[PDB]
Amino acid sequence: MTTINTHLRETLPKIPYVKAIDMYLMGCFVFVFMALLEYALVNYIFFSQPAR
Amino acid sequence: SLSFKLKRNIGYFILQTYMPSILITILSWVSFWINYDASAARVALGITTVLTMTTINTHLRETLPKIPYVKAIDMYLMGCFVFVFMALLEYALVNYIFFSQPARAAAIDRWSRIFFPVVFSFFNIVYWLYYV
Amino acid sequence: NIVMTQSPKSMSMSVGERVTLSCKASEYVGTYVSWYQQKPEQSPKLLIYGASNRYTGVPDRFTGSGSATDFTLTIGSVQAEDLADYHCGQSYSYPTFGAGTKLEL
Amino acid sequence: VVAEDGSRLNQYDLLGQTVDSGIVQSSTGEYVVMTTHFHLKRKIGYFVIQTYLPCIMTVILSQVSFWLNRESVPARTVFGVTTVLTMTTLSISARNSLPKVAYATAMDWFIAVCYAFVFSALIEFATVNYFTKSQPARAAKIDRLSRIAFPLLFGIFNLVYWATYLNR
Amino acid sequence: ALIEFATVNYFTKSQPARAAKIDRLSRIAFPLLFGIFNLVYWATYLNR
Amino acid sequence: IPCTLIVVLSWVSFWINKDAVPARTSLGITTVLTMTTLSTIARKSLPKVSYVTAMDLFVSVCFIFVFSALVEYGTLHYFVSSQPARAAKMDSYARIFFPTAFCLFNLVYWVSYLYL
Ligand SMILES: *[C@@H]1O[C@H](CO)[C@@H](O[C@@H]2O[C@H](CO)[C@@H](O[C@@H]3O[C@H](CO[C@H]4O[C@H](CO)[C@@H](O)[C@H](O)[C@@H]4O)[C@@H](O)[C@H](O[C@H]4O[C@H](CO)[C@@H](O)[C@H](O)[C@@H]4O)[C@@H]3O)[C@H](O)[C@H]2NC(C)=O)[C@H](O)[C@H]1NC(C)=O
Ligand SMILES: CCCCCCCCCCCCCCCCCC(=O)OC[C@@H](COP(=O)(O)OC[C@@H](N)C(=O)O)OC(=O)CCCCCCCCCCCCCCC
Ligand SMILES: Cc1ccc(-n2c(-c3ccccc3)nc3ccccc3c2=O)cc1
């Protein structure tokens, strides 16, 4: 996701506001980040409750 | 003839290429503090460090002309890459003798912990007294 | 508008001494402040234009200084004909004048 | 006089204009010069999205590695190395927009502190792994302290930085 | 090199002697062939 | 050449031991990121036209192949816990179905585009 955003930002100029493509890339980033945090949570709490 | 003598300021390059590579070499040294029982972790450190150095170089060279001889920044980046590569090769050497004789493997890890920073400091002193 | 606060309201000094009149501008006026000398029952006379530019016929003791909001008029070695009112005005925008400054002995 | 619709400014804001008149002494004489000053304030939005949010995100990701189990050395090692790599890429990217000045800007200081936090997290993991299997109590205690210290220190730094750079 | 590792891993835990044999042969073969190629390549593009 | 080489590199996973999860996962995902970088460059060769060229159809099919290899490993690993025989035969089935499909796609693509 980082490298896709990197390659994209090169073409455009530097504008202060967020474009629709930028919001989509932010959303996909946040979802990937949340999947990683889901694994982090699962690993933290597994040792206590294997069912949870 | 009107001539000008220009001295190049170095702070930008410290911020851009010198500090990152130094920090990446420090990172490389962490491998020797990780138990030599872990293969995935140590190889991850070494390979990631090598590739990060290559990235620093590639981003740097895209802003210079195609010059035959070696620039001083090139000398520093090559030396840092050699240091990272030597850390990776030291881990490979440890892994080659892990099972057969863990005592000498631990001795090699300890010696590396001692002597990678020292040799790096010597190289830095030579480099920074040759040019500065 | 632009308020020109001129201080002091009045002041007295003997003949031969150096004085400094000061004028404060509310907003930025650049170097577009002029100093006027008004003797009693007479019309004003331009002394300093720009901010430091002696108008023709102005003796060399009068001198102005300052930029932006802070300005001053130093009369070095005042004589007996330097007794008058002294007005500061800005011409950066539509003109405004300071309340004035009376000079006695 | 500036026209109402006449703004081709992408990255800046035209706050107003100022004029003045003066004199410059050249080698050929004394010349009148007329000056106009156009006051421009840079808009921070582009740099927020492109540098500040990524740096904060990488700091958060680096600190998330503390909550992992100590019995996963490869996972935390991957976290540390990849976060450091991302920080290096971001630091190389950030300067590319500005001229090659010889001093450090506010963005440079922010990136430096973020790099310090990522590096510190990795060194904390290295220490924890070193004390694991010999003094597990010490390793667990320092990890537990880190879980609080790192986010709080980062938050305090962010508060101070933004307060001192949004009020000047 | 990647293919050789894949073959070793495929033949590991089934024919360990074979895996060790191919690994210890590659350890000498690969550097030797790369050096031979380098020598030939440079000799043909520089002696010109 | 780089795209097909990346595809065969993705194939290599089918021979790795099914138990080595990090190895095969990393193999697949790195293949994917290399694929996306290659796609970016290749399309950057030419102007920004909205229709599909012959080159990016090839690149997209290569990306689909790499994605297929990674998801196939994911499903195999998931079925390990449920049914061992299913995963065991799935590995060998993929080993043959992937290269055959790629050769078939190559034949169709080159026949259609070269003879036009
Ligand atoms: C940037 O780069 C430029 C170009 O390389 C430099 O310019 C050179 O500057 C030096 C010194 O400033 C010049 O050297 C001068 O040459 C003069 C003429 O030389 C005649 O005489 C000598 C013998 O004395 C012969 O060998 C030569 O062929 C000529 O016939 C000298 O007169 C100058 O003074 C010398 O003699 C006097 C005698 O009293 C001594 O006092 C002096 O110390 C000195 O020895 C001087 O030697 C050189 O010519 C320039 N190059 C060119 C191509 O013109 C800039 O200096 C350099 N730095 C900067 C900041 O721009
Ligand atoms: C755009 C271009 C891109 C093209 C990319 C495609 C590349 C294709 C390039 C494909 C070539 C790939 C080579 C890697 C294969 C490794 C060997 C292997 O898998 O099989 C050998 C096996 C058979 O013998 P055994 O079974 O051990 O016999 C004893 C007993 N079991 C019995 O059988 O009785 O073991 C050996 O002997 C090992 C010796 C070979 C090692 C490598 C040397 C040659 C290449 C060395 C280096 C190769 C050089 C390659 C460069 C030209
Ligand atoms: C359009 C756009 C801009 C920036 C980012 N981005 C976000 C990031 C930051 C805030 C919200 C979502 C993603 N983190 C990162 C963390 C590390 C490295 C790169 C990025 C990144 O490039 C993603 C998309």
Curated annotation (Swiss-Prot), chain B:
Residues 31-40 are cytoplasmic. It comes from the Eukaryota. Changing residue 52 to K: In IECEE2; uncertain significance. It is found in: Postsynaptic cell membrane; Cell membrane; Cytoplasmic vesicle membrane. Changing residue 84 to I: In IECEE2; uncertain significance. Isoform 1 and isoform 2 show reduced expression in schizophrenic brain. Isoform 3 shows increased expression in schizophrenic and bipolar disorder brains while isoform 4 shows reduced expression. Residues 61-78 are extracellular. The chain crosses the membrane at residues 10-30, 41-60, 79-99. It is linked to Epileptic encephalopathy, infantile or early childhood, 2: A form of epileptic encephalopathy, a heterogeneous group of severe childhood onset epilepsies characterized by refractory seizures, neurodevelopmental impairment, and poor prognosis. Development is normal prior to seizure onset, after which cognitive and motor delays become apparent. IECEE2 is an autosomal dominant condition with variable age at seizure onset, ranging from early infancy to 6 years. Beta subunit of the heteropentameric ligand-gated chloride channel gated by gamma-aminobutyric acid (GABA), a major inhibitory neurotransmitter in the brain. GABA-gated chloride channels, also named GABA(A) receptors (GABAAR), consist of five subunits arranged around a central pore and contain GABA active binding site(s) located at the alpha and beta subunit interface(s). When activated by GABA, GABAARs selectively allow the flow of chloride anions across the cell membrane down their electrochemical gradient. The extracellular domain contributes to synaptic contact formation. Belongs to the ligand-gated ion channel (TC 1.A.9) family. Gamma-aminobutyric acid receptor (TC 1.A.9.5) subfamily. GABRB2 sub-subfamily. This is Gamma-aminobutyric acid receptor subunit beta-2. It comes from Homo sapiens. The lineage of its organism: Eukaryota, Metazoa, Chordata, Craniata, Vertebrata.
Swiss-Prot record, chain D:
Belongs to the ligand-gated ion channel (TC 1.A.9) family. Gamma-aminobutyric acid receptor (TC 1.A.9.5) subfamily. GABRA1 sub-subfamily. 3alpha-hydroxy-5alpha-pregnan-11,20-dione binds at residue 67. The chain holds residues 207 to 339 of 456 of the full protein. Alpha subunit of the heteropentameric ligand-gated chloride channel gated by Gamma-aminobutyric acid (GABA), a major inhibitory neurotransmitter in the brain. GABA-gated chloride channels, also named GABA(A) receptors (GABAAR), consist of five subunits arranged around a central pore and contain GABA active binding site(s) located at the alpha and beta subunit interface(s). When activated by GABA, GABAARs selectively allow the flow of chloride anions across the cell membrane down their electrochemical gradient. Alpha-1/GABRA1-containing GABAARs are largely synaptic. Heteropentamer, formed by a combination of alpha (GABRA1-6), beta (GABRB1-3), gamma (GABRG1-3), delta (GABRD), epsilon (GABRE), rho (GABRR1-3), pi (GABRP) and theta (GABRQ) subunits, each subunit exhibiting distinct physiological and pharmacological properties. Interacts with UBQLN1. Interacts with TRAK1. Interacts with KIF21B. Identified in a complex of 720 kDa composed of LHFPL4, NLGN2, GABRA1, GABRB2, GABRG2 and GABRB3. Interacts with LHFPL4. Interacts with NLGN2. Interacts with SHISA7; interaction leads regulation of GABAAR trafficking, channel deactivation kinetics and pharmacology. Changing residue 127 to A: Reduced potentiation and activation by the agonist alphaxalone. This is Gamma-aminobutyric acid receptor subunit alpha-1. Functions as a receptor for diazepines and various anesthetics, such as pentobarbital; these are bound at a separate allosteric effector binding site. The extracellular domain contributes to synaptic contact formation. Residues 96-105 are extracellular. Residues 69-73 are cytoplasmic.
Swiss-Prot record, chain F:
Residues 17-22 are cytoplasmic. The chain crosses the membrane at residues 1-16, 23-42, 55-79. Belongs to the ligand-gated ion channel (TC 1.A.9) family. Gamma-aminobutyric acid receptor (TC 1.A.9.5) subfamily. GABRG2 sub-subfamily. Heteropentamer, formed by a combination of alpha (GABRA1-6), beta (GABRB1-3), gamma (GABRG1-3), delta (GABRD), epsilon (GABRE), rho (GABRR1-3), pi (GABRP) and theta (GABRQ) chains, each subunit exhibiting distinct physiological and pharmacological properties. Interacts with GABARAP. Interacts with KIF21B. Identified in a complex of 720 kDa composed of LHFPL4, NLGN2, GABRA1, GABRB2, GABRG2 and GABRB3. Interacts with LHFPL4. Interacts with SHISA7; interaction leads to the regulation of GABA(A) receptor trafficking, channel deactivation kinetics and pharmacology. It comes from Homo sapiens. It is found in: Postsynaptic cell membrane; Cell membrane; Cell projection, Dendrite; Cytoplasmic vesicle membrane. Gamma subunit of the heteropentameric ligand-gated chloride channel gated by gamma-aminobutyric acid (GABA), a major inhibitory neurotransmitter in the brain. GABA-gated chloride channels, also named GABA(A) receptors (GABAAR), consist of five subunits arranged around a central pore and contain GABA active binding site(s) located at the alpha and beta subunit interface(s). When activated by GABA, GABAARs selectively allow the flow of chloride anions across the cell membrane down their electrochemical gradient. This is Gamma-aminobutyric acid receptor subunit gamma-2. Palmitoylated by ZDHHC3/GODZ; required for the accumulation of GABA(A) receptors at the postsynaptic membrane of inhibitory GABAergic synapses. The chain holds residues 281 to 361 of 475 of the full protein. Residues 43-54 are extracellular.
